[PDB]
Structures are given as C-alpha cells and as structure tokens.
Design an enzyme around this catalytic site. Structure first.
Site, short mmCIF file in Angstrom:
data_model
loop_
_atom_site.label_atom_id
_atom_site.label_comp_id
_atom_site.label_asym_id
_atom_site.label_seq_id
_atom_site.Cartn_x
_atom_site.Cartn_y
_atom_site.Cartn_z
N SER A 32 1.49 2.32 8.81
CA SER A 32 1.48 1.07 7.83
C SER A 32 2.61 0.70 7.24
O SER A 32 3.64 1.46 7.34
CB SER A 32 0.99 1.95 6.21
OG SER A 32 -0.22 2.28 6.46
N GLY A 33 2.81 -0.45 6.97
CA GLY A 33 4.23 -0.82 6.71
C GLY A 33 5.18 -1.33 7.84
O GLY A 33 6.13 -2.08 7.38
N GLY A 91 0.08 6.24 8.84
CA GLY A 91 1.63 6.26 9.04
C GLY A 91 2.42 5.41 9.72
O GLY A 91 3.45 5.23 9.75
N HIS A 134 0.85 -1.07 0.03
CA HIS A 134 0.07 0.15 -0.01
C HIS A 134 0.92 1.34 -0.01
O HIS A 134 0.53 2.23 -0.53
CB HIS A 134 -0.57 0.11 1.22
CG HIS A 134 -1.90 0.82 1.58
ND1 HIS A 134 -2.59 1.72 0.34
CD2 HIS A 134 -2.48 1.34 2.60
CE1 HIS A 134 -3.28 2.55 1.02
NE2 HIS A 134 -3.48 2.32 2.38
N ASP A 173 -0.36 -7.64 1.09
CA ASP A 173 -0.19 -6.10 1.45
C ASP A 173 1.41 -6.11 1.92
O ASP A 173 1.75 -5.90 3.14
CB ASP A 173 -0.95 -5.43 2.42
CG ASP A 173 -0.88 -3.95 2.49
OD1 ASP A 173 0.13 -3.43 1.53
OD2 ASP A 173 -1.15 -3.15 3.16
N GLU A 211 16.49 6.44 12.69
CA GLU A 211 15.68 7.32 13.18
C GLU A 211 15.25 7.23 14.44
O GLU A 211 14.66 6.23 14.68
CB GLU A 211 14.69 7.38 12.16
CG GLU A 211 13.74 8.75 12.11
CD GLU A 211 14.67 10.10 11.61
OE1 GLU A 211 15.15 10.42 12.81
OE2 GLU A 211 14.53 10.56 10.70
#
Ligand SMILES: *C(=O)c1cc(N)ccc1[C@@H](OC(C)=O)C(=O)OC
Length: 240
Positions: free
Chosen positions: A188-189, A186, A45, A93, A59
């Site tokens: 997602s993934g 935000g 996605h 996904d 990060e």
C-alpha cells in the site's frame, strides 16, 4: 508482492520504505515514492494511525545493511482533504510526507517521475509494481524488494461487473488481475511504474486489493491515479 521476482538493487531508486516505531524497533508498513529530496508520496491509508514514522531511501533488504540506506524522519503529514478512512472506494487515497531532512541523490536514490496531469494509459499498458509487501495472501513480508509485471486494465473493463464494478472510480488505475501476480498488504502506498515514451513514470499509488485475497482473477490491484492529483501535489509542495 504476490508472484514477484527480486528486483536488481538499482532498478527502482524512487522506492521508499515507510516504517513506524514498534516498541524499541522499526517495522515496515508501506511503500512510497520519493518525489522531492524532501517529499514522499504514499497512500493516506498508510498514515491513518498516529504513530511515529520514518522514511528509508536506498533500501533493498529490510533485514540487512545494504551499505546504501538513508534514514529520515517525517516532519509533516498532509493527507488529501477528501480522504475518508471508512470509504477507500471513494478514492483520494493519497498523502504527501515532508521529511525532516533532504536526502542525498545517487544511484540508489532518485526522484520518481510523475505523469502529466490527466494522463490515462491504454489498456494492457506495460507496468511494474514494486514493494516489500506480503508474498502470498496471509503470508509474510518480503525481505528484499520484489517486482511484478502488472499490465493495466482500463476503466471500462475494470468497472465492469465481473471486475470491480462500481467500487472502482476513474480516479483510480487498475493493473494485473491474472490470479498469479498482485500487490498485497505492505505494498500500500508504493509505486506502479509504467513505461511511457521510453521512461518509467509512477502512474499509481497502491491502494487496495480484494477482501477475498491479494491475487484474485479479475480483481486487479487498484491504485490511486497519480495523473488525477498533479495540481494538488504541486499546490502542497509550493506552500509547505
Ligand atoms: C497496505 O499496506 C495495506 C495494509 C493493511 N494492513 C491492510 C490493507 C492494505 C491495503 O493493501 C494493498 C494491497 O494496498 C488495502 O487493501 O487497503 C484497502
């Protein structure tokens, strides 16, 4: 992440920020997991748009220099062949990003450990969601990496009517659903890190929450089940 707490800097060193070029700046869009010094696992996605993407490893604060960042280009994107943009509830996904360079591994930068193929967790298994996503439904992104304790909810409960029903497939993991804690847009993934034989392994790629809101009682956050994809993930990497 709804209802989360700030993570310690070094807690989750396989977490990446997936960012797109937004005019003359870069904005966070997704999470992911560093799986090889040159490969990231995220959700299909997150790469439906044909945008210019970069990876941030090490990060912690999106808006400040941590002194630990590495910034790497995406060189090739490989989405699962059965992913269809119009049907997230079909699954698949999942995406693998090859990076323009190999990153250097240190305490802020490690590989994610993947489950064994086929591995299913027991109900109410101890898992964490991480990410820089929204911190309330319709809210704003976090600046610092957030974590939430999100126990699993097995397929028989998750696919029951008072849960997700048929929307959820056995190719997916569900976790959370307390009303208080969730993933949110935000995240997602990103990873769902779960504790198995005293090691955290990434069992989930964050996929979807409810149209009704991120933190909704009996709507757990839904992940792509990584253990269903191990053959495909290996087959991509060996050949690309
Ligand atoms: C994921 O980052 C994201 C972002 C946007 N703008 C919409 C939806 C999503 C997914 O959210 C999460 C929590 O994974 C989503 O729900 O996809 C269906």
């Amino acid at each position: 992440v709804v209802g989360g707490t700030e993570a310690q800097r070094n807690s989750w060193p396989s977490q990446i920020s997936l960012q797109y070029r937004s005019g003359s700046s870069w904005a966070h869009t997704c999470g992911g997991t560093l799986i090889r010094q040159n490969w990231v696992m995220t959700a299909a996605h997150c790469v439906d748009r044909e945008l210019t993407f970069r990876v941030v490893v090490g990060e912690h604060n999106l808006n400040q220099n941590n002194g630990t960042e590495q910034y790497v280009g995406v060189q090739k994107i490989v989405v699962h062949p059965y992913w269809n943009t119009d049907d997230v509830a079909a699954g698949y996904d999942i995406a693998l990003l090859r990076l323009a360079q190999s990153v250097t591994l240190n305490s802020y930068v490690q590989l994610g450990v993947l489950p064994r193929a086929g591995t299913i967790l027991a109900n109410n298994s101890p898992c964490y969601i991480t990410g820089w996503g929204l911190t309330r439904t319709n809210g704003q992104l976090a600046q610092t990496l957030q974590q939430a304790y999100l126990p699993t909810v097995d397929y028989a409960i998750c696919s029951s009517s008072s849960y997700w029903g048929s929307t959820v497939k056995n190719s997916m993991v569900c976790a959370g659903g307390d009303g208080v804690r969730s993933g949110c847009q935000g995240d997602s993934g990103g990873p769902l890190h779960c504790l198995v034989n005293g090691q955290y392994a990434v069992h989930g790629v964050t996929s979807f929450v409810s149209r009704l809101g991120c933190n909704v009682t009996r709507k757990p956050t839904v992940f792509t089940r990584v253990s269903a994809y191990i053959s495909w993930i290996n087959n991509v990497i060996a050949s690309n």
